[PDB]
Amino acid sequence: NWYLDNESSRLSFTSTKNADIAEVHRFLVLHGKVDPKGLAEVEVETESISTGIPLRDERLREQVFQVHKFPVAQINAQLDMRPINNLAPGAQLELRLPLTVSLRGKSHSYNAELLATRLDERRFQVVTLEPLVIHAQDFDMVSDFNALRNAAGLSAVSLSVPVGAVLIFTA
Amino acid sequence: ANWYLDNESSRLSFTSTKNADIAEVHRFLVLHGKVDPKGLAEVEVETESISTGIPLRDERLREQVFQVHKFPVAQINAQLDMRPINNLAPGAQLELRLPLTVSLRGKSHSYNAELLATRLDERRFQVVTLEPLVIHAQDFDMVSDFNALRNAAGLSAVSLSVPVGAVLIFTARE
Numbered sequence: 001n002w003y004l005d006n007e008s009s010r011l012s013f014t015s016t017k018n019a020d021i022a023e024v025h026r027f028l029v030l031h032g033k034v035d036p037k038g039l040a041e042v043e044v045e046t047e048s049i050s051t052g053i054p055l056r057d058e059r060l061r062e063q064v065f066q067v068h069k070f071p072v073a074q075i076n077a078q079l080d081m082r083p084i085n086n087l088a089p090g091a092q093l094e095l096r097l098p099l100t101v102s103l104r105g106k107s108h109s110y111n112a113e114l115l116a117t118r119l120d121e122r123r124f125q126v127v128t129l130e131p132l133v134i135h136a137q138d139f140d141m142v143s144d145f146n147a148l149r150n151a152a153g154l155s156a157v158s159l160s161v162p163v164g165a166v167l168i169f170t171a
Numbered sequence: 172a173n174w175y176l177d178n179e180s181s182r183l184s185f186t187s188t189k190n191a192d193i194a195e196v197h198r199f200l201v202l203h204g205k206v207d208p209k210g211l212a213e214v215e216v217e218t219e220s221i222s223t224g225i226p227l228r229d230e231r232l233r234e235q236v237f238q239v240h241k242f243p244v245a246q247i248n249a250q251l252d253m254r255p256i257n258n259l260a261p262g263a264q265l266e267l268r269l270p271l272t273v274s275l276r277g278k279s280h281s282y283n284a285e286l287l288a289t290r291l292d293e294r295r296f297q298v299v300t301l302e303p304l305v306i307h308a309q310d311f312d313m314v315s316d317f318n319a320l321r322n323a324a325g326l327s328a329v330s331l332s333v334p335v336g337a338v339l340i341f342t343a344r345e
């Protein structure tokens with residue numbers, strides 16, 4: 001019933017390399033749906049990675065995301081829709097929400113800190129109140145991160161990746 | 172105007188990275204802020220209100236890094252073009268790039284934030300960072316203090332970069 005409006009939404013993440021160099025990246029194409037029973041799914045087109053350096057995007061698409069095998073990452077959660085449907089337009093609810101992220105067919109559970117705000121009769125916003133930190137090891141990507149750091153000669157790429165999102169859904 | 176920040180509805184957070192591979196999210200519990208009708212905006216952070224979930228770490232940050240006894244407030248200052256924001260209908264959003272200045276521990280540094288402004292109702296707006304603002308320790312002459320914290324906590328490394336995010340609600344009220 002609720003569908004994600006990609007043009008209004010943003011999913012970003014921060015990498016830290018060489019100890020002190022933080023950079024923010026994004027994915028350009030998301031999809032998402034929340035059904036009346038509160039089953040929520042967001043799908044990220046991993047090919048739509050955009051880090052600002054095209055050759056880096058390609059290396060990530062080949063080596064880390066492996067998009068030729070896994071063009072989609074999935075984020076899944078189960079909401080209690082009662083309090084969300086009760087929000088008046090303009091009103092917000094803080095949700096601390098278990099969810100699952102699936103990357104390459106590996107899944108891991110995290111706890112998200114989200115803010116849900118009703119925008120109008122048919123539009124809803126969900127934002128990360130604080131970014132959600134994932135770790136390469138959770139998806140068996142440690143050797144893939146280490147591979148990158150090297151061939152594109154760095155001291156190091158941090159194995160933690162904080163993820164933020166502003167998601168707009170429309171009825 | 173004037174617009175005032177509703178602390179209970181807002182959150183300013185930041186991420187530190189330790190031992191190369193562990194990112195942790197922390198926040199401040201007490202903010203204030205005002206935007207005047209001319210678009211002059213100021214956010215104050217009470218730095219004593221740091222919350223990392225470890226009291227000892229909170230105390231080290233207060234004393235060593237923030238020096239709350241000399242500087243209990245950090246300030247964020249900007250000048251907004253109010254017209255396009257005020258023109259938003261409830262539920263509508265505008266992306267903007269906002270030059271701003273942060274003053275922390277008696278030093279200042281300028282940034283440009285990528286923000287989304289959304290009108291919530293006739294007297295309330297939400298402002299969120301679409302990407303965090305990345306502060307570096309050297310921006311505020313804090314490098315040695317970061318290394319001191321690293322040393323105190325027995326860490327092999329603390330990143331000198333700190334991405335800062337916010338979800339801020341402002342209300343046209345007294």
Ligand SMILES: COC1=C(OC)C(=O)C(C/C=C(\C)CC/C=C(\C)CC/C=C(\C)CC/C=C(\C)CC/C=C(\C)CC/C=C(\C)CC/C=C(\C)CCC=C(C)C)=C(C)C1=O
Pocket residue numbers: 013015016017034040041042044051053055056059060064073075076077079084095099101103112114116124126128132134145148149152154157161163164165167
């Ligand atoms: C070519 O030149 C090069 C360089 O420079 C020249 C380089 O520096 C480098 C070095 C590499 C760089 C420094 C960058 C490296 C970046 C790294 C390695 C990649 C990290 C990627 C990770 C696997 C993370 C990817 C992100 C995920 C796919 C997204 C997951 C999203 C999750 C966490 C959820 C977030 C959203 C929220 C929780 C909202 C959810 C809410 C819904 C589910 C429900 C909503 C419903 C409502 C109503 C409540 C290279 C390699 C290079 O080639």
Ligand SMILES: COC1=C(OC)C(=O)C(C/C=C(\C)CC/C=C(\C)CC/C=C(\C)CC/C=C(\C)CC/C=C(\C)CC/C=C(\C)CC/C=C(\C)CCC=C(C)C)=C(C)C1=O
Pocket residue numbers: 174183185187189195206212214216225227228229231236245247249251256269271273275284286288296297298304306317320321323324326329333335336337339341
């Ligand atoms: C025993 O316990 C301990 C540990 O546990 C193991 C430790 O790991 C450790 C080791 C320490 C580490 C783990 C942590 C490292 C911490 C380090 C030093 C980080 C330090 C943090 C600071 C330097 C960063 C501070 C950032 C802030 C002050 C800046 C805030 C700026 C904000 C976000 C500005 C953005 C907002 C604006 C752009 C909005 C403008 C307003 C308008 C747009 C509003 C518009 C109005 C309309 C009308 C709506 C210790 C010490 C310990 O004691």
